Protein backbone atom coordinates (compact mmCIF):
# COMPACT_ATOMS: atom_id res chain seq x y z
CA UNK A 1 0.00 0.00 0.00
CA UNK A 2 1.94 3.00 -1.28
CA UNK A 3 0.55 6.46 -0.65
CA UNK A 4 2.73 8.14 -3.24
CA UNK A 5 3.66 11.77 -2.49
CA UNK A 6 6.07 12.33 -5.42
CA UNK A 7 4.87 13.79 -8.73
CA UNK A 8 7.00 13.37 -11.89
CA UNK A 9 6.53 16.13 -14.47
CA UNK A 10 7.92 15.71 -17.99
CA UNK A 11 8.32 17.95 -21.06
CA UNK A 12 8.71 20.97 -18.81
CA UNK A 13 12.00 22.07 -20.44
CA UNK A 14 14.82 20.91 -22.66
CA UNK A 15 18.48 20.94 -21.47
CA UNK A 16 19.36 23.29 -24.35
CA UNK A 17 17.09 25.87 -22.69
CA UNK A 18 19.93 26.48 -20.20
CA UNK A 19 22.99 26.58 -22.38
CA UNK A 20 22.82 30.24 -23.34
CA UNK A 21 21.50 31.70 -20.08
CA UNK A 22 22.70 30.40 -16.68
CA UNK A 23 19.75 32.02 -14.82
CA UNK A 24 16.93 30.20 -16.59
CA UNK A 25 17.21 26.98 -14.58
CA UNK A 26 16.55 28.72 -11.27
CA UNK A 27 13.89 30.89 -12.85
CA UNK A 28 11.88 27.88 -13.96
CA UNK A 29 12.54 25.93 -10.75
CA UNK A 30 11.11 28.81 -8.73
CA UNK A 31 8.17 29.14 -11.17
CA UNK A 32 7.38 25.49 -10.55
CA UNK A 33 7.62 25.94 -6.78
CA UNK A 34 5.10 28.79 -6.96
CA UNK A 35 2.56 26.87 -9.06
CA UNK A 36 2.95 23.64 -7.08
CA UNK A 37 2.59 25.40 -3.74
CA UNK A 38 -1.03 25.95 -4.76
CA UNK A 39 -1.67 22.25 -4.23
CA UNK A 40 -0.05 21.78 -0.82
CA UNK A 41 3.19 21.85 1.15
CA UNK A 42 6.26 20.87 -0.86
CA UNK A 43 8.89 18.72 0.81
CA UNK A 44 11.42 18.48 -2.05
CA UNK A 45 11.72 19.95 -5.54
CA UNK A 46 14.17 18.59 -8.14
CA UNK A 47 14.81 19.51 -11.74
CA UNK A 48 16.85 17.02 -13.74
CA UNK A 49 18.40 19.65 -15.99
CA UNK A 50 20.43 17.21 -18.12
CA UNK A 51 17.56 14.83 -18.80
CA UNK A 52 16.38 15.14 -22.44
CA UNK A 53 12.76 14.55 -21.41
CA UNK A 54 12.60 17.72 -19.26
CA UNK A 55 11.89 15.92 -15.97
CA UNK A 56 11.16 17.46 -12.59
CA UNK A 57 10.03 15.78 -9.39
CA UNK A 58 7.84 17.44 -6.77
CA UNK A 59 7.40 15.70 -3.42
CA UNK A 60 4.43 16.78 -1.26
CA UNK A 61 3.77 16.39 2.48
CA UNK A 62 0.52 14.46 1.91
CA UNK A 63 -0.62 12.05 -0.81
CA UNK A 64 -3.81 14.08 -1.36
CA UNK A 65 -1.73 17.07 -2.47
CA UNK A 66 0.20 14.95 -4.97
CA UNK A 67 -3.09 13.54 -6.32
CA UNK A 68 -4.48 17.06 -6.78
CA UNK A 69 -1.27 18.29 -8.41
CA UNK A 70 -1.42 15.40 -10.88
CA UNK A 71 -5.08 16.09 -11.70
CA UNK A 72 -4.43 19.79 -12.35
CA UNK A 73 -1.00 19.81 -14.05
CA UNK A 74 -1.19 16.88 -16.49
CA UNK A 75 -1.78 18.34 -19.94
CA UNK A 76 -1.26 21.95 -18.93
CA UNK A 77 1.08 24.31 -20.84
CA UNK A 78 4.38 25.68 -19.44
CA UNK A 79 6.49 28.01 -21.56
CA UNK A 80 4.77 26.79 -24.72
CA UNK A 81 5.28 23.07 -23.96
CA UNK A 82 2.51 20.66 -22.93
CA UNK A 83 3.59 18.83 -19.78
CA UNK A 84 2.69 15.46 -18.31
CA UNK A 85 2.29 14.85 -14.61
CA UNK A 86 2.11 11.41 -13.04
CA UNK A 87 2.82 9.48 -9.86
CA UNK A 88 6.41 8.44 -9.39
CA UNK A 89 6.90 4.69 -9.78
CA UNK A 90 8.98 4.68 -6.59
CA UNK A 91 12.05 3.22 -8.25
CA UNK A 92 13.22 5.30 -11.22
CA UNK A 93 16.07 7.78 -10.70
CA UNK A 94 16.01 10.50 -13.30
Amino acid sequence: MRHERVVIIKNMFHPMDFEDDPLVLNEIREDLRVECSKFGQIRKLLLFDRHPDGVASVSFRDPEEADYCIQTLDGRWFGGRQITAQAWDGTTDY
Binding site: I28, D31, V34, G79
Partner: peptide, 4 residues
Protein backbone atom coordinates in the same frame (compact mmCIF):
# COMPACT_ATOMS: atom_id res chain seq x y z
CA UNK B 1 5.86 33.33 -15.55
CA UNK B 2 5.46 30.63 -18.16
CA UNK B 3 2.31 29.03 -16.78
CA UNK B 4 -0.53 28.31 -19.23
Amino acid sequence: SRWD
